Design a protein around this ligand. Sequence first.
Ligand SMILES: *[C@H]1c2c(cc3ccc4cccc5ccc2c3c45)[C@@H](O)[C@H](O)[C@@H]1O
Ligand SMILES: [Ca+2]
Ligand SMILES: [Ca+2]
Length: 341
Amino acid sequence: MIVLFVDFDYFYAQVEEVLNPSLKGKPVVVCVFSGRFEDSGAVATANYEARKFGVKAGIPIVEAKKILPNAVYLPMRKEVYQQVSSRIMNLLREYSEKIEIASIDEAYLDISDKVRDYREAYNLGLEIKNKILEKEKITVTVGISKNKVFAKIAADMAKPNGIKVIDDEEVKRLIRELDIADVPGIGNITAEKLKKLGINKLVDTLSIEFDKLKGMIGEAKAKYLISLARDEYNEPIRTRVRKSIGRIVTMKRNSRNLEEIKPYLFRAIEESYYKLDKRIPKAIHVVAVTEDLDIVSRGRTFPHGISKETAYSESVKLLQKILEEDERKIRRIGVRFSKFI
DNA sequence: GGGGGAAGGATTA
DNA sequence: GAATCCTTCCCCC
Ligand SMILES: *[C@H]1c2c(cc3ccc4cccc5ccc2c3c45)[C@@H](O)[C@H](O)[C@@H]1O
Ligand SMILES: [Ca+2]
Ligand SMILES: [Ca+2]
């Protein structure tokens, strides 16, 4: 299997740079202004000019303005990015039927039946970068290797506007030398447990009692890392099927008053139902973000599809169960639908 | 024992 | 911006 992964560079920010060329060169920051006060909210992403100074995805807008008070701050325009993303994804389908769209700006192509070696794969990578640059003027980074994980790692090492191949030999080298925290799917919580077990490389997972690893990070995570360590990871590139769809809305002020929360809840339902677009869910979950930012959720699965009216009455029951079983004030209230027919 | 499915919390980019 | 993962609990052959 030969996998080719594409990751659009600082995507949201780059799309804004494309719709407004004067932004190129300056530091650009795309935000999600929450609506609580003056500049409440967080940074969704920033271009490299801004990242040079520590302004990156995740930090509060307030902090970003203390680092770069003069950068360009743009409100996120998700619909526009999604549209551009759809177009670029269509460019990608002309290079392979087997394609896995992982997120708004990441996709995996199984090009095993299109190239004979990594040299041909690397050239197809350039072709793709050129085509996207030609049609949409967006630079992306290509990663290529024997499987999805290494193709992704390959792109992480080469971004921005890069391209890299990780042949079978370098895979073996990385299995011994790559910091295990840089492996896709290993986030902080998992990385800290591996450090506290003396595991810093994938290879280290081969010399520990399985049950001890499975006990600290879970069976799936353990089998996953072990299979990568043994150079036996080969998950196929499959089509992604959206499994849940929802919306959560931040309330004007945190509350525990059902009648005060209702309007927001119902808004989340209306939005979600639109997003569903012809999809009929059998399951619904009301999701609450408490004042201390913890997440409490209550759901229900029906034996038939949920109609909007049913979603209305059921979400209220579910909201009370949350209010009943938890005493904290609610900050954000939302809904999530799943188990489509 | 384990296939099968529902539910809630954990974890991730 | 949200979505999937993972672990536990339980019906039933
Ligand atoms: C948006 C938000 C937040 C946390 C996460 C955590 C992990 C994610 C993995 C993949 C996609 C994704 C999209 C939005 C996310 C994610 C992820 C919150 O910190 C934030 O409040 C928003 O909900
Ligand atoms: Ca990206
Ligand atoms: Ca990590």
